[PDB]
Amino acid sequence: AHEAQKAIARNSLLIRSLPEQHVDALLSQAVWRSYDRGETLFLQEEKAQAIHVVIDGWVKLFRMTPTGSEAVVSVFTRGESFGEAVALRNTPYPVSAEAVTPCEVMHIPSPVFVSLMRRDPEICISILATTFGHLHSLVAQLEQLKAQTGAQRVAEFLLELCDCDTGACEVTLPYDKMLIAGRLGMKPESLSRAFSRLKAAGVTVKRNHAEIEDIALLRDYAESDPADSWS
């Protein structure tokens, strides 16, 4: 049931961390919700009663400054989970979450996940083994010299958003491209230059989506020697 959506959810950090034999039973207890653009998923200080996985669209997390301004903390999109830590600690949400585009989300109720581990601590032991190996892998990667240019980093981001490894591709983006800039740690104008350069690699960015004519061509751009002018 809900098979295509569940396949998307399997790419998330939450679901990738689980032992494979327990995934189906847990996905079968999901609550599926849609959100309009601008709709609240949850608010700061509410109880963390579920862990969240974006199936489609873009969700932003933000906190209120005491001056009253929304400070964006993160944006998440299809195949990405969030709220794991706070749901397992059962502490109040430190941020609010709002749909930036129309969204579909899969919510896993916290007690469904927690009770599994309290009944069988071998499950939490397997999950933790996996997350440790993953932490080590990310720490080792952060240690390794990065040479990619700004444009290359955006190419890489776009490639990760596409499902396939060849052919044309289309990825939906927030209208406000500053959210992507934030995510990539780039100045707004740097993101714009990157998009401009990527025209030459087959990428056209529009208001609500990007068009990649050839995934292979884009991957070539990304992988090419940063110190070379490309094509």
Using CB under 8 A, which residues numbered 7 to 66 contact its own copies?
13-14, 17
Among 1, 24, 185, 228, binds its own copies (CB under 8 A): 185
User: Residue 3 CB, nearest distance to its own copies (Å)?
Assistant: 26
Please report which residue ranges of the chain form alpha helices under DSSP H: 3-9, 13-16, 20-27, 84-89, 110-119, 121-143, 150-161, 178-183, 188-199, 215-223
Using CB under 8 A, which residues numbered 130 to 169 contact its own copies?
130-136, 138-150, 153, 157
Cα dist from 88 to 3, 64, 128, whole Å = 26, 23, 13
The β-bridge relationship of strands 80-82 and 50-56 is: antiparallel
Does 186 interact with its own copies (rule: CB under 8 A)?
yes
Choose the binding region for its own copies from 35-43, 168-176, 185-193, 207-215 (rule: CB under 8 A): 185-193
CA distance 10 to 32: 15
State which H helix or E strand residue 146 sits in: none
Burial class (CB in 10 A: 0-12, 13-18, 19+), 50: buried
Among 107, 184, 217, 230, binds its own copies (CB under 8 A): 184
User: Residue 141 CB, nearest distance to its own copies (Å)?
Assistant: 6
User: Residue 220 CB, nearest distance to its own copies (Å)?
Assistant: 19
Does 229 interact with its own copies (rule: CB under 8 A)?
no
Tokens 């800039």 sit on residue? 181
Among 31, 40, 46, 121, binds its own copies (CB under 8 A): 121
User: Residue 62 CB, nearest distance to its own copies (Å)?
Assistant: 15
Q: Which is nearer to its own copies, 26 or 88 (CB)?
A: 88
Instruction: Determine contact, residues 110/88, Cβ cutoff 8 Å.
Output: yes
- Positions that interact with its own copies (CB under 8 A): 13-14, 17, 74, 82, 84-86, 88-89, 114, 117-118, 121-122, 124-136, 138-150, 153, 157, 183-186, 190, 226
